[PDB]
Design an enzyme around this catalytic site. Structure first.
Site, mmCIF file in Angstrom:
data_model
loop_
_atom_site.group_PDB
_atom_site.id
_atom_site.type_symbol
_atom_site.label_atom_id
_atom_site.label_comp_id
_atom_site.label_asym_id
_atom_site.label_seq_id
_atom_site.Cartn_x
_atom_site.Cartn_y
_atom_site.Cartn_z
ATOM 1 N N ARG A 49 82.636 63.195 0.417
ATOM 2 C CA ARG A 49 81.221 63.050 0.164
ATOM 3 C C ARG A 49 80.794 63.855 -1.087
ATOM 4 O O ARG A 49 81.128 65.065 -1.240
ATOM 5 C CB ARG A 49 80.444 63.600 1.367
ATOM 6 C CG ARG A 49 78.990 63.869 1.164
ATOM 7 C CD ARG A 49 78.279 64.314 2.502
ATOM 8 N NE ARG A 49 76.840 64.553 2.318
ATOM 9 C CZ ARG A 49 76.264 65.743 2.095
ATOM 10 N NH1 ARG A 49 76.979 66.874 2.012
ATOM 11 N NH2 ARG A 49 74.936 65.799 1.918
ATOM 12 N N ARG A 90 57.711 68.920 -3.184
ATOM 13 C CA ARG A 90 57.807 70.312 -3.609
ATOM 14 C C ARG A 90 56.430 70.894 -4.016
ATOM 15 O O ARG A 90 55.530 70.182 -4.487
ATOM 16 C CB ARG A 90 58.811 70.495 -4.745
ATOM 17 C CG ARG A 90 60.366 70.313 -4.367
ATOM 18 C CD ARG A 90 61.216 71.412 -5.051
ATOM 19 N NE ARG A 90 62.644 71.102 -5.227
ATOM 20 C CZ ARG A 90 63.586 71.195 -4.275
ATOM 21 N NH1 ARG A 90 63.267 71.580 -3.042
ATOM 22 N NH2 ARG A 90 64.851 70.885 -4.540
ATOM 23 N N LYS A 238 70.350 57.926 6.353
ATOM 24 C CA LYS A 238 70.217 59.293 6.891
ATOM 25 C C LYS A 238 68.893 59.441 7.619
ATOM 26 O O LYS A 238 67.837 59.236 7.015
ATOM 27 C CB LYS A 238 70.294 60.376 5.769
ATOM 28 C CG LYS A 238 71.663 60.298 4.988
ATOM 29 C CD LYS A 238 71.711 61.179 3.671
ATOM 30 C CE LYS A 238 71.514 62.656 3.942
ATOM 31 N NZ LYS A 238 71.463 63.430 2.639
HETATM 32 K K K Z 1 71.898 64.749 -0.678
#
Ligand code: K
Ligand code: K
Ligand code: K
Ligand code: K
Ligand code: K
Ligand code: K
Ligand code: K
Ligand code: K
Lengths: 493, 492, 493, 492
Positions: A49, A90, A238
């Site tokens: 990965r 952010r 994810k």
């Molecule tokens: K990532």
């Protein structure tokens, strides 16, 4: 029915002769060299990965080249996964570099871009332009890993929120923020993702681990960003927040598989509920027949310690009992001090868990869910696995060019290895995230198209013999189901 | 069929209206006062554990007294468990109080009592007189928590073993040793345990946690030491090494329940194998219908930090999924900084896990293992639980005086609360180690013998109503279980 | 799963210690005396059927009195059933008493009442005024037992049908007719039925076998003709034609049980389909928990022969395998020459069939059909039978005042006797058409209302002991489910 | 689960598009001509039975010849079965050709051969030399179809039994006797059977119906008499008395199939018990995967009347429900007045019964009895049938040269037609006694060895299409079964 199988078990009996779970390792400074990558492969790595949250294209090209060189020198097929940075929320900058947030204080969070380089404890910038529309009075806003918890009191104006500070914490420039009771509507792919996905396609990566997936339409945005040349690259979504978890069915349907990102989930959801979200998401993927990866905080203390804690080991074993195809290592291999030892111990724990897992419960639970009439492919794969259990066969051979029928057989969880004989090297690599399958490449250009399948069947049976899975007199269940079909129960010679 | 049940769950749904799993807390400096014991009780403690490894009888007497006063003021019944010190293997003293053991070096371990006050890195005493008979060349001998691993090369003489030091460590005075390859043949109960157990009987403890149980015969020794006045006290065997695991079936059959001591088992058995032994031991107890406790290393980092690690949370949740009746805190409550918060958090994790657990799998798995013909008690209790699932009843009421039939119903894992109505306070306390049961004391002196059972039935149904378990129009399954009887009650 | 049970059987093993099927006998000249009725009862009769197609009220009063006297002298409770003549379609009279119907000939059938005493082969009367509306060209009309088959060609006029004669046959005055492709709409109860049903109520009969039931609304017409004083009399519907078979679900729902009248069915339906209609109707009744009787052509050749044919015996055994509660005898006992021998052989065949029948298949098939959540009564009765099988109990005791819970327990088919303790003699008699149940009368007036049930339970257990069903140390499963409930597994003392 | 299936049936629905059960017809005076044999075939005969109790070899030769010519002209394959005469017990001759036996009277039965031509009501000969050893006081001896029942009182001498006559009857010359309480120990095959069996081998019959089989050893005797050229001929054991029933398991294991001779069994066993033995024997054969025939007293009243009785119709239907592969006609076709109509009517009853029968119950019942691990053939065939039910396939095609795997598939009872493609005509004929199969002959000389199997597969799928079993878009399950292979074919 694990329960009845537990009663028969002995911890002093030998482990199985094959490990079904697959190990994904993240590449970083501890592991990027060709030699280190060879140590990983020999330790049990099946997938490399690349974390594109950090590092340049040149840096990731080096991983790509070194992985391919390390795998060629060892004679094996290793998948390469590109894990995207993804959209981020952010804060801006604070004056003096820093800002000291006290408990009980009032502060103002604004999306007015005038404030990006001049925040203060009094008022600062969060760069998500929709912040005000998405949050309401009472909602919480987390900053710095969820450490600083501000609570939203009111809309000072159309771009600025009056907040209470609920706990003390000094925060420096540009911390990440989360929004746990909030449906975040950032695009599926940032402008950097779009460049980074185009690079993965040019360099022939096998799969994308797509960050922060919240809905089914966002999986289609990743796919469209891969373009027509990236159509055979798998998209693993994810799952990182409550939206991904709520929309999991439609996300599963559109994706090629799922990553359970327990650490990101746990920023906004109680850890005990993440444990349950893990069980749920793994079982839905097992039923869909799609690979599911259990990721983050896996053997984390083995990043700097030579052994993990007992609870960490129980965590990896339980991922395997829950049904995970794959367990993933992050800093343990990227920047850790025992990369080989952590992979080897992870393989060890997986093997020990498997030896106690009753696979027949999976097979029978999944089969009971099938509607009658079944389609031909689902009937053939399920009945081939059932034949394994009925004859106590010791291996299966599946001829699958794209990997589709090998995944469909692995879904039904035989209690023996599956050898997939395929004419595509990219299928060998993509099957590294499917549990219980090993692939054998059949070079049909040189060896002939093998229309009657005999050569590909014999190559599969030879592979099983050379691994000790079968010997003269055992049974091997062969299957082909091309998206035409055929099953055979072969007496091994 | 947990798999099918996972598909339909949402973590955004409300959790169950009851918590089935039971929490045992070790009492020490952080928690012995009356007010701190009330805090634990309100936080979710059902059982007070006294660790007799430390403390005098006066000290433990104060724990017993204070527990009783705390429970009385809150109007609840709390069980008191006496956890024995047990047999130990220890080294002797070293000269200079220390001994610097080094990798590759040679040393001599002897059972010659002459050396008990005068060992050195060269030669020292281990107080287990059978050391030489039990060990062989190749075997390892662990000392100091399994940190210092010595390998056994030879019998220097009939009482002395020549050892390689396989790795370095310093070891101070009187460390404990283990013998992973070795069938240790120490006594079941030491003289100090016999003394402690008689004191437990005099003070009326509800159960013994008996350390280091290795065989069935040894359970009888504990039962002997308890004597004829201690016959109603439960004996829970602590399984702490490979002999206990090997002999699990015969130990379960003699004991009243099991504690899985993960941290002690982990001295000689690899950690991934102890995960699996835990599954096995818990399933064997679930099938036997006897309580099983998951102990040690539970939420350990929460002794000094205000939150545990994520892996510790999953370990607690997975004990409940494996089938554990109880989860047990040790230093987190005995000496920790957050005793109330750790118990509240354990209870929250247990309740989250239970709300995902498919109880029907356990019921059906255990029912299929029953030999036909079944004896009447088994038949009544399993069919009473079957009737819960067939009618979607919302509580069970079980009249049980010794708690036997309450444990028998609990074994079959209904998906609703079980309310046990009993005429014995000791039964209320001892059922605190059985998952899924709440006890209602029926005062037979103050209220009569109720031999028609009607008052007791009403008291259980009244309790289930007051908890919000049933209301008008719900079904409640009622059982008394050698005479027996089951009714499916429509609630008024 | 009869199949696995067949493999374990031996025809040389002893038969069971109780016979579950019940025998109904029709009373006529061979059997009407008190002494003959006693021979029947001792041979195995549980129900005396009066065929009201023939005989006066005085004649049936004699059966009624003699049955009651015969049962009192023997100390037993025998049901009395009134079987109605029902609506009939008949031809009129022919000139010269007779009329010679030739194959190929044309004749005219009319409902013009002018023709009732002057039919001829050319034109005659059928007394069903709706004949023309119900029949169409192509339909068949059967006369004389279905022997003469006329086919309808056309409507000569609004009351007269032109017919072809399809086969030769001489027919005398007033033959019965059938209409196999025709929905016959005669009233449910004739004017004579109405008088006859009123007589049954006055004389306290236990059940009505209601002739020629075609629809659910007709069961309600029988019920209304019984009046408020006949509300506890059971109505057993006789299924005799295609309409009864088509409407069987709604008829079952409204009735108290079913009679499968195979001989009447076979006038209009092929015999092989009647075999299948029998299986269907018995199984629907078994699922409804209502008594079903297999009637007509049972051991018919034993009316004048001392033994039946082998196929007759296989017919009675297969009624029991199909699930029949009751087997019925008609002329075999009414006018036959071996009334005692035919009852005894019928009991013998039933006992032998039962010894091979796997009852657990019934229990498990019926239980699998139940919807969750079950109501309390269905959960209690099913779980009491399940406890019989789990403990191998040797009897059940059911306290049932109306018989409702005794029938609900018998529906689930335990493999042991059921003893029903009831406070009503009419329940003892009505339970004689439910298989596997014996009743014990508990005289609550003299013996006390027995609020805690102990006395009625002990009377049930004593009865089982005195019959040898249980002895010290066996299990007995007790149940009460009053339309409050309770089950007990009793160790017999 | 036949019960659940009964609930959903309607007798007004269309019957199945195929009849699974097979009809065997006995040939005699009504039916031996070529034209009458064509009539039987068109009416539904799959098997021609030759009863060797009567007729010379020339007579039976004409049956064989005529069957072959009839089948050839209609383009079908018909099996030929040779039903042996067997061992018989007979009385001898009486004086005056008659003997008036009377209730209560005394008589003497002797095996002294001196009396074979000179018996009387007083003393006569029974030709079974072991009579006295096998019988005992109390035992009954039936004579004349079991009409005349004698009871045995004593051994007058070592060859003579003193008997009571328990009921009256006259009995003419040479009646047959039975011994219901008695283990008869006559030979398996008589000299005449050995002669007949060799003639069967020379003429190429497909199967033997072997009379009066009592033990496994006796099947070997029949197999011996058939000799090495008769090794592919099926032996079907006729079970005709209590020894056959008792020894059923060992007989099935040696034979190729069973005939349940209800009328012969009924001589010594009560009729209600023969109903039950029929169930048992048929279920044991279904489980063994071997053909079972229900024979005698089938539609007997239809020998002389144009319709049978309703009870006879139910007996035929219930043989099919019990699981029988075949139903067999005797005098109805050999000497009856309505041979075509009786076979048409039997076929109609069988088709009505089948359309109610739940085939899944048989499949599931037999699958659950299989020992794990299964051998590969069993595993392939049971899973191929499972795939029919899972995909709702509308036919199976089974390539089988000896018919072994076709019988193995048929055993599992798919709910669709099975088409067996074979290269042996003898296989086409022998599968006529297996329910649910139709055979297609693939001429390997005229068409090649087809070792890729493709032509044979196409021929089976083409046959199923021509019968209207499958059309475009249906599934067909294809199997060859030691190499094997299953395909679920989508039909084009
Ligand atoms: K990532
Ligand atoms: K395993
Ligand atoms: K201790
Ligand atoms: K739950
Ligand atoms: K009538
Ligand atoms: K039975
Ligand atoms: K013969
Ligand atoms: K069918």
């Amino acid at each position: 029915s694990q329960l009845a199988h537990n009663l028969t078990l002995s911890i002093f009996d030998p482990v199985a002769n094959y490990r079904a779970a697959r190990i994904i390792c993240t590449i970083g400074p501890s592991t990027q060299s060709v030699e280190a990558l060879k140590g990983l492969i020999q330790s049990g790595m099946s997938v490399a990965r690349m974390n594109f949250s950090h590092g340049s294209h040149e840096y990731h090209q080096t991983t790509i080249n070194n992985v391919r060189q390390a795998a060629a020198e060892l004679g094996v097929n290793i998948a390469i996964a590109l894990d995207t940075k993804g959209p981020e929320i952010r804060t801006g900058q604070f004056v003096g570099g820093d800002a000291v947030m006290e408990r009980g204080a009032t502060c103002y969070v604004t999306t007015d871009p005038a404030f990006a380089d001049k925040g203060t404890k009094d008022k600062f910038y969060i760069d998500y332009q929709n912040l005000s529309k998405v949050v309401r009075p009472g909602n919480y806003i987390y900053i710095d890993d969820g450490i600083l918890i501000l609570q939203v009191q009111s809309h000072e104006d159309e771009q600025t929120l009056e907040c209470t500070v609920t706990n003390s914490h000094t925060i420096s420039d540009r911390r990440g923020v989360n929004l746990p009771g909030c449906d975040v509507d950032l695009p599926a792919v940032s402008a950097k993702d779009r460049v980074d996905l185009q690079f993965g396609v040019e360099q022939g990566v096998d799969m994308i681990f797509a960050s922060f997936i919240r809905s089914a339409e966002q999986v289609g945005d990743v796919r469209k960003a891969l373009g027509p040349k990236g159509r055979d690259i798998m998209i693993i979504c994810k799952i990182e927040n409550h939206q991904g978890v709520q929309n999991i069915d439609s996300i599963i349907e559109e994706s090629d598989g799922i990553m359970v990102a327990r650490g990101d989930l746990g920023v906004e959801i109680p850890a005990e509920k993440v444990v349950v979200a893990q069980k749920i998401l793994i079982s839905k993927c097992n039923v869909a027949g799609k690979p599911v990866i259990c990721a983050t905080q896996m053997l984390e203390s083995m990043t700097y310690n030579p052994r993990p804690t007992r609870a960490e080991v129980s965590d990896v074993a339980n991922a395997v009992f829950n049904g995970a195809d794959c367990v993933m290592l992050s800093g343990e291999t990227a920047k850790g001090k025992y990369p080989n030892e952590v992979v080897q111990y992870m393989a060890r724990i997986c093997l020990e868990a498997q030896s106690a897992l009753n696979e027949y419960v999976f097979f029978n639970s999944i089969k009971k869910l099938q509607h009658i009439p079944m389609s031909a492919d689902e009937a053939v794969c399920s009945s081939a696995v059932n034949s394994v259990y009925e004859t106590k066969a010791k291996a299966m051979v599946v001829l699958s060019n794209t990997g589709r029928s090998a995944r469909l057989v692995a879904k039904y969880r035989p209690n023996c290895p599956i050898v997939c004989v395929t004419t595509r090297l990219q299928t060998c690599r993509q099957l590294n995230i499917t549990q219980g399958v090993e692939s054998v490449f059949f070079d049909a250009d040189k060896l002939g198209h093998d229309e009657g399948k005999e050569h590909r069947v014999a190559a599969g049976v030879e592979f099983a013999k050379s691994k000790g899975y079968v010997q003269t007199g055992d049974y091997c269940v062969v299957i082909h189901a091309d998206h035409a079909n055929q099953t055979r129960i072969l007496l091994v010679e």
